[PDB]
């Protein structure tokens, strides 16, 4: 069936290729490290020597790269081939650089769609999988059926930045959660307590988060930060406890100092007696 190019054979790239092949699609691939295509070439994919060859081979070109800098390095050696193609970039970078790259690709006569895949490689193509998409809807809809093999497509809008924004926002929560889990683990291991004793508590803590956060949405929407049940003076004190405990234990202080700086800036803005939601008032961009 339809031949699709994929450039970028990291684990996400490979999982996407395997899924396109298992559903009848032909897949041309190219990677900076050619040896990395062996597993997918064996499963039915066509390696090709040059980026220009890979772009020329198909209408739809998927990029699974570390960043957008890598797109310029790869497609920079394929500018003439781009005319009439559809670039779907499934790579992390800033929203601003996502729009700049859309303009560069369209100036070379291709369409540009941004994607953000919201599961790891092992879940590509399964039921859990979903992908943010943004860019021209007519073009997107022409290729929805193929893209949906990777995960449920969530088309956010024509502003090509939206998929990147949602990706970065989810990443913000995700990387924080990892670093916080490792930080808490580090504090525990520092005291000689095995992590198996703490895990059930950490697990419960993360599983309960949705409950503590749901009510906060309205408070943040409205600037309504009542402190009667928990205040920034009490929570900011705790944050300083965490910082001192971290110094005492010889573990990282960057993460707990960053969180303490939220409480300190809030106290300086007079929000001592407000809910922790008031931190939003010092974290948000100036409406000024």
Ligand X SMILES: NC(=O)c1ccc[n+]([C@@H]2O[C@H](COP(=O)([O-])OP(=O)(O)OC[C@H]3O[C@@H](n4cnc5c(N)ncnc54)[C@H](OP(=O)(O)O)[C@@H]3O)[C@@H](O)[C@H]2O)c1
Q: Work out whether 278 is an interface residue with ligand X (CB under 6 A).
A: no
State the Cα–Cα distance between residues 164 and 144, nearest whole angstrom.
18
Q: Examine residue 7 and tell whether it contacts its own copies (CB under 8 A).
A: no
Question: Which alpha helices (DSSP H) does 69-120 contain, by range?
Answer: 69-75, 95-107
Task: Name the minimum Å distance from CB 158 to its own copies.
Answer: 14
Alpha carbons 136 and 163: distance in angstroms, whole number:
12
Q: Do 27 and 2 touch, CB atoms closer than 8 A?
A: no
Determine, following the binding rule CB under 6 A, whether residue 230 of this chain makes contact with ligand X: yes
d(CA 54, CA 52): 6
Q: Which of 166, 224, 225, 271 binds its own copies (CB under 8 A)?
A: 166
Q: What is the DSSP letter of 51?
A: H
State the minimum distance, in angstroms, from the CB of residue 275 to ligand X: 10
Counting contacts by CB under 6 A, is residue 51 touching ligand X? no
| CA dihedral for 41, 27, 156, 159, sign (positive or negative) | positive
- 71-90 positions binding ligand X, by CB under 6 A: 73-74, 90
- Using rule CB under 8 A, residue 184 touches its own copies: yes
The phi and psi torsions of 43 (rounded to 5 degrees) equal: -85, -5
Q: Which is nearer to ligand X, 66 or 284 (by Cβ)?
A: 66
Complex with ligand X: residue 171 or 258, whichever CB lies closer:
171
Interacting residues toward ligand X by CB under 6 A: 8-13, 31-33, 36, 64-66, 69-70, 73-74, 90-92, 117, 120-121, 229-231, 234, 238
């Amino acid at each position: 069936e339809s031949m699709i190019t994929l450039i970028g054979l990291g684990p996400m790239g490979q999982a996407m290729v395997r899924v396109l092949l298992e559903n009848g699609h032909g897949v041309t691939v190219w990677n900076r490290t050619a040896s990395r295509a062996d597993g997918v070439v064996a499963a039915g994919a066509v390696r090709v020597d040059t980026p220009a060859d890979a772009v020329a081979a198909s209408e739809l070109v998927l990029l699974s790269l570390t960043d957008y800098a890598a797109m310029y390095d790869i497609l920079g050696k394929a500018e003439e081939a781009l005319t009439g193609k559809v670039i779907v970039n499934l790579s992390s970078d800033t929203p601003e650089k996502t729009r700049e790259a859309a303009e560069w690709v369209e100036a070379r006569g291709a369409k540009f769609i941004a994607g953000g895949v919201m599961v790891p490689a092992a879940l590509v193509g399964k039921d859990e999988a979903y992908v943010f998409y943004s860019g021209p809807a007519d073009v997107f809809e022409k290729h929805r059926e193929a893209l949906a093999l990777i995960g449920r497509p969530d088309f956010l809008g024509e502003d090509v930045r939206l998929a990147q924004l949602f990706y970065q926002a989810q990443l913000d929560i995700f990387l924080n959660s990892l670093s916080a889990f490792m930080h808490a683990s580090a504090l525990v291991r520092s005291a000689g307590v095995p992590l198996e004793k703490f895990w059930p508590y950490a697990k419960d803590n993360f599983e309960s988060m949705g409950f503590y956060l749901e009510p906060a949405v309205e408070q943040i929407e409205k600037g309504d930060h009542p402190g009667d049940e928990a205040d920034v003076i009490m929570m900011g004190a705790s944050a300083g406890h965490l910082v001192q405990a971290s110094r005492d234990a010889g573990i990282d202080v960057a993460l707990p100092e960053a969180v303490k700086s939220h409480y300190d800036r809030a106290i300086a803005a007079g929000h001592g007696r407000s809910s922790w939601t008031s931190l939003f008032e010092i974290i948000k961009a100036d409406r000024k």
